[PDB]
Amino acid sequence: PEARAELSSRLTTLRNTLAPATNDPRYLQACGGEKLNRFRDIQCRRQTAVRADLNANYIQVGNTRTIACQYPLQSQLESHFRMLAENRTPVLAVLASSSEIANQRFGMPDYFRQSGTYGSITVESKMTQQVGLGDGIMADMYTLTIREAGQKTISVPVVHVGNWPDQTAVSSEVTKALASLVDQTAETKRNMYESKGSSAVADDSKLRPVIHSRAGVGRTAQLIGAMCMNDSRNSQLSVEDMVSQMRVQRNGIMVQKDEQLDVLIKLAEGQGRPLLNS
């Protein structure tokens, strides 16, 4: 608890440092009245913004590269599909529940479980498998095929965790299981691009996991820290570096609740990974 006590003081000073001021030059700003941010206080670092009209961030913790973003507002589903397709997305992991998506006061379009046209893009959706992850959590798998005229059709694998509640932490075991299922999905898809000579394969602002929830700072950040602890390449990287990297690169809220951080602390503990630096 002492080590845990010190990890929290350090992470809590950083949250306060990073709190967005009014017209903060560190955070990406809304343009010309179109709304950017689904929650006015969950801002996007401008230095790592993926595009100018999405609250979306390139993240890199250690060697593990991903894109973390909020749930697109309606205004944004054409750009959100544009980003999915230009990234040659190897896997989209969607962590907002069906209840959340279904409740229309929440403004969460059900963009991937049905077909649609969104400006010049047309997307087709198809349910393929349903994997159980443990403790009752379930992933339903979809394939989104994204087509826009005069452009190369792209197809994205979707893992949707249908029943993970906002503000909660699923267990170490559902997390471990989830992180593996999203990395393996990513891998089959990346190996498909590589057998075809994709130029995306060279480029390291492409072929990144896109993970989001609602705000994309809680359930999104707990999955991301477990994907990062799963790469042998991220040896000795403490939990304090990992959360600090996530927060300097998107916003200081990443790993929002203390229950989500404790799941990352027990996964650390079991690998014999450090909490604190030095």
Whole-angstrom Cα distance, residue 66 to residue 60?
6
Q: Phi then psi for 96, rounded to 5 degrees? A: -75, 135
H/E element, 139: strand 137-148
CATH topology of domain 1-278: Protein-Tyrosine Phosphatase; Chain A (3.90.190)
Tokens read off for 60? 């890199």
Q: Tell the residue number behind the tokens 């393929």, with chain if given.
A: 128
Give CA 6 to chain center in angstroms: 27
The three-class DSSP label of residue 199 is helix
Tell me the one-letter amino acid at 190.
R
Whole-angstrom Cα distance, residue 263 to residue 250?
21
Closest CA to 28 of 50, 7, 12, 13: 50
| C-alpha angle 256-261-264 in degrees, rounded to nearest 5 | 135
Q: Where are the alpha helices (DSSP H) in the chain?
A: 2-17, 77-86, 98-102, 172-194, 219-228, 239-249, 258-271
Q: How many CA atoms lie within 13 A of 56 on its CB side?
A: 23
Number of other CB atoms surrounding residue 128 within 10 Å: 10
Following CA atoms 69, 72, 75, 76 in sequence, which dihedral angle do they give, to the nearest 10 degrees? 50
With 0-12 / 13-18 / 19 or more C-beta atoms within 10 angstroms meaning exposed / middle / buried, residue 230 is middle
Whole-angstrom Cα distance, residue 104 to residue 118?
19
Closest CA to 38 of 257, 216, 223, 167: 216
Give CA 91 to chain center in angstroms: 10
Which residues lie below 8 Å from residue 44, measured CB to CB, with a gap of 6+?
Answer: 27, 28, 36, 37, 54, 55, 56, 57, 250, 251
| Biggest CA pair distance of the chain | 59
Resolution (in Å) of the shown entry?
2.5
Helices 239-249 and 2-17, packing angle to 10 deg: 10
Classify residue 206 by its DSSP letter.
Answer: S
Whole-angstrom Cα distance, residue 250 to residue 237?
19
Sheet holding 210-212, edge to edge: 56-61, 64-69, 210-212, 92-94, 154-161, 137-148, 121-134, 116-118
Q: Tell the residue number behind the tokens 């907002």, with chain if given.
A: 96
Q: By the 8 A CB rule, do 66 and 227 touch?
A: yes
The three-class DSSP label of residue 30 is coil
